[PDB]
Design an enzyme around this catalytic site. Structure first.
Site: not given
Ligand code: CL
Ligand code: ZN
Ligand SMILES: *[C@@H]1O[C@H](CO)[C@@H](O[C@@H]2O[C@H](CO)[C@@H](O[C@@H]3O[C@H](CO)[C@@H](O)[C@H](O)[C@@H]3O)[C@H](O)[C@H]2NC(C)=O)[C@H](O)[C@H]1NC(C)=O
Ligand code: NAG
Ligand code: NAG
Ligand code: NAG
Lengths: 188, 595
Positions: B254, B326-327, B356, B359, B462, B486, B496
């Site tokens: 990612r 997780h933040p 953060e 936000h 891919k 996700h 994203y």
């Molecule tokens: Cl994959």
């Molecule tokens: Zn965020």
């Protein structure tokens, strides 16, 4: 004897804004030095008369209105406001002559589970006239089909509760408000 | 009219929903900061009461004729309540669909893989598998972690994701949608002001169209990184083929961030990682957020509320509790703003504190909107608002003026290629991965990929789109898409991609109002009450105006633009084309490390 402002300001229990109570002040010398030589208040906003001439002044009688609103609702306790508190709960006249005092009370008026005692009116056919008071719990009929006493679809109960919790923001914390009206027996 | 009847109806909703949403929001905070089986029910039952209220009001607002409204705030409030929701499903098929989501979420988190060379060691995804994929330089070790996750916890997701598709298609199809893919695209839909409308299918055309001005930059980063990876893994990578999937820096590729240790242009220079300086100055989690608070007031924005400083979990609970590390930036309502993050004394968590808290500033501004309009302009607005904060917080001009970098740090023409390269490995490296993923699920929801060849077409995409090849062949028992969070946790992923283009449209417009003068990557909007008010104007907007309008109030465009992102990396883009004159830019979609 001096006027009993302690019976209204340091009163243990305060009423809801919709059912605000009024106290008449009669033949007595008033002690405005304790309200002024203290930073205890969060606002202290005067109208019609100055914050320092009322010391050497006399009035026909003085009326103290006490109640509780949220943090952000204090601005509506002023002549010419159009919020829910001003329009459906407590309307001040445009020629109001007095002072409005408020202070934060999260430590006393907000419990962990939420203080659902303090309430306010959310719905009302038409606005409130100056200095009017409405305490009816009659079901508000927003539609045409009659409520018939039972609330529901387009039939909403009028009064709603604040529900103060200590974790709420300062703009959603309970503030005790006192409105001192001057009408033209009470001197300084 | 049905106007005042709906006017004096959304008001009954705004007062009854804020109380129920707080009972539900305060329940999620009490579980995430004190994990208890008792708190599981409190977090669920207090949310289920909120889950039954939103359905009753969704149905009741559907009685009100939507067209018969003449004021725009009320128009926009109703459509947000006009959605039929997910209760259009059967009674029992809802429960099985609601149960497969837990089984996917659990086998994604409880998923453990064990080493054949050492069976007593069994690792989780975090911190076990992610640490191998992010730091190991052994081709066979990284291959094991990549395959074990897709063959052991990935294959368990295969029968569930098949039913997960068929059940949530039945949910979207009954709500006047084509498929579950069309359900997510409704986020960017606008049916209102003249010149500001936007179709659901228009989203597919836009992400593809803007992706073309990205291919020049991405193809060269791919060719530069591949040449650098042939040194770290010699005799494994073809100088013309795609990159193997397990060598990309994390579990799925990612982000290419962890490849910086292998792809740094000028590593002989002093590193910009200021983690050590924070540790020897005795910084704690208080100092990070307190310093980050000072950043926002420097532009006129309000301080963090005292309720934030008292109700936030800015450290790992320590001496009692279990916590989801997780933040997250939490907006409970009624002025209650909190941040939940297991902060460590590092530069990476220092920059996230600016993200953060960014936000929260967005949350604090639109608090004046009605309850239905208290949300980002679209799904990508919040994540782009937090990134522009960390873009300004990472510049050397900001780090020295805070006291972390040395006042005589040499900002060469090479220290900026080193910086923009690391930015490219994180910002642009994730763009083709994001589009290929959401395009695949869009087609799978569309039904264009039959379930007897789900995995064949996934890897054909891919290699073509991302330039990433599978290291071992995968038949249909695998479920590599659901191997990501996700995907197996029912989350939209195109956000994203959109937020990334937005965060540079904002950065371009904000630095112009902040009158920045050098390259855009050197801009720090600190001390800019001028640019702060420009950003404030769209933060207060919330979900009221369409996202096309809220975007236009700051960047001056009715749609996303790729021009700002390419200008940010322009110093790096031209430098890559010099490096790749003897390299091969592009890849062949036919090479595979097994064949
Ligand atoms: Cl994959
Ligand atoms: Zn965020
Ligand atoms: C604009 O942004 C800059 C960058 O942070 C801020 O400048 C910094 O301001 C502090 C004062 O708060 C300066 O500290 C000073 O250090 C000297 C020692 O040299 C000391 O004797 C003074 O008493 C003072 O503490 C700091 O040097 C300065 N640094 C830079 C790079 O400018 C400034 O405060 C911001 N202006 C705003 C927010 O209005
Ligand atoms: C309430 O108690 C405080 C205690 O210091 C006192 O100063 C104040 O005068 C009291 N209020 C009134 C209206 O007398
Ligand atoms: C964790 O939750 C329990 C309720 O099961 C509660 O009694 C306890 O006080 C909580 N922990 C802390 C540190 O408050
Ligand atoms: C950096 O600057 C030096 C001297 O100005 C120059 O010789 C060199 O080519 C430049 N390199 C880069 C990558 O900017």
């Amino acid at each position: 004897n001096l006027c009993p402002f302690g019976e209204v300001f340091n009163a243990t229990k305060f009423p809801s804004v919709y059912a605000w109570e009024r106290k008449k002040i009669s033949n007595c010398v008033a002690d405005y030095s304790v309200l002024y030589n203290s930073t205890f208040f969060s606002t202290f906003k005067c109208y019609g008369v100055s914050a320092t001439k009322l010391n050497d002044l006399c009035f026909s009688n003085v009326y103290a209105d006490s109640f509780v609103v949220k943090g952000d609702d204090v601005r509506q306790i002023a002549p010419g406001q159009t919020g829910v508190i001003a329009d459906y709960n407590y309307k001040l006249p445009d020629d109001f002559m007095g002072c409005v005092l408020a202070w934060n009370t999260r430590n006393i008026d907000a419990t962990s589970t939420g203080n659902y005692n303090y309430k306010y009116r959310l719905f009302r056919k038409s606005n409130l006239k100056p200095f009017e008071r409405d305490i009816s719990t009659e079901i508000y009929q927003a539609g045409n089909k009659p409520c018939n006493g039972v609330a529901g679809f387009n039939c909403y109960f009028p009064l709603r509760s604040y529900g103060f919790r200590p974790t709420y923001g300062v703009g959603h914390q309970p503030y005790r408000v006192v409105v001192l009206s001057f009408e033209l027996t009470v001197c300084g | 009219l049905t106007e005042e009847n709906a006017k004096t109806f959304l008001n009954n909703f705004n007062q009854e929903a804020e109380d129920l949403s707080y009972q539900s929001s305060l329940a999620s905070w009490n579980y995430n900061t004190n994990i208890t089986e008792e708190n599981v029910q409190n977090m669920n039952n207090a949310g289920d009461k909120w889950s039954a209220f939103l359905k009753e009001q969704s149905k009741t607002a559907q009685s009100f004729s939507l067209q018969e409204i003449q004021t725009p705030i009320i128009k926009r409030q109703l459509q947000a309540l006009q959605q039929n929701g997910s209760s259009v499903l059967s009674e029992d098929k809802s429960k099985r669909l609601n149960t497969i989501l837990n089984t996917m979420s659990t086998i994604y988190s409880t998923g453990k893989v064990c080493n054949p060379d050492n069976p007593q060691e069994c690792l989780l995804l975090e911190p076990g598998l992610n640490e191998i994929m992010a730091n190991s330089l052994d081709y066979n070790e990284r291959l094991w972690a990549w395959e074990s996750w897709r063959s052991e916890v990935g294959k368990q997701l295969r029968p569930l994701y098949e039913e997960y598709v068929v059940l949530k298609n039945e949910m979207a199809r009954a709500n006047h949608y084509e498929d579950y893919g069309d359900y997510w695209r409704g986020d960017y839909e606008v049916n209102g002001v003249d010149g500001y409308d936007y179709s659901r299918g228009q989203l597919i055309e836009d992400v593809e169209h803007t992706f073309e001005e990205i291919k020049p930059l991405y193809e060269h980063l791919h060719a530069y990184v591949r040449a650098k990876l042939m040194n770290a893994y010699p005799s494994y990578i073809s100088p013309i083929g795609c990159l193997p999937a397990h060598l990309l820096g994390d579990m799925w590729g990612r982000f290419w961030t962890n490849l910086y240790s292998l792809t740094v242009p000028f590593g002989q220079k002093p590193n910009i990682d200021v983690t050590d300086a924070m540790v020897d100055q005795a910084w704690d989690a208080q100092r990070i957020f307190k310093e980050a608070e000072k950043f926002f007031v420097s532009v006129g924005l309000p301080h963090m509320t005292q309720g934030f400083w008292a109700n936030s979990m800015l450290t790992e609970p320590a001496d009692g509790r279990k916590v989801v590390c997780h933040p997250t930036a939490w907006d409970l309502g009624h002025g209650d703003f909190r941040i939940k993050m297991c902060t460590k004394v590092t530069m990476d968590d220092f920059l996230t504190a600016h993200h953060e808290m960014g936000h929260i500033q967005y949350d604090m501004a639109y608090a004046a909107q009605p309850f239905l309009l208290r949300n980002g302009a679209n799904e990508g607005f919040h994540e782009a608002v937090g990134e522009i904060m960390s873009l300004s917080a990472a510049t050397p001009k900001h780090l020295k003026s805070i006291g972390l970098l040395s006042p005589d740090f040499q900002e060469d023409n090479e220290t900026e290629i080193n910086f923009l390269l690391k930015q490219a490995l994180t910002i642009v490296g994730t763009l083709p991965f994001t589009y290929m993923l959401e395009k695949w699920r869009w087609m799978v929801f569309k039904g264009e990929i039959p379930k007897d060849q789900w995995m064949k077409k996934w890897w054909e995409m891919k290699r073509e789109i991302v330039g990433v090849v599978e290291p071992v062949p995968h038949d249909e028992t695998y479920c590599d898409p659901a191997s990501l969070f996700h995907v197996s946790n029912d989350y939209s992923f195109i956000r994203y991609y959109t937020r990334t283009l937005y965060q540079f449209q904002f950065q371009e417009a904000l630095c112009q109002a902040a009158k920045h003068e050098g390259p855009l990557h050197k801009c720090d909007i600190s001390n800019s009450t001028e640019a702060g008010q420009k950003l404030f104007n769209m933060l207060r907007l919330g979900k009221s105006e369409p996202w096309t309008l809220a975007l236009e109030n700051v960047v001056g465009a009715k749609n996303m633009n790729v021009r700002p992102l390419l200008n940010y990396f322009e110093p790096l883009f031209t430098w890559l084309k010099d490096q790749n004159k003897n390299s091969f830019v592009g890849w062949s979609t036919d090479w595979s490390p097994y064949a």
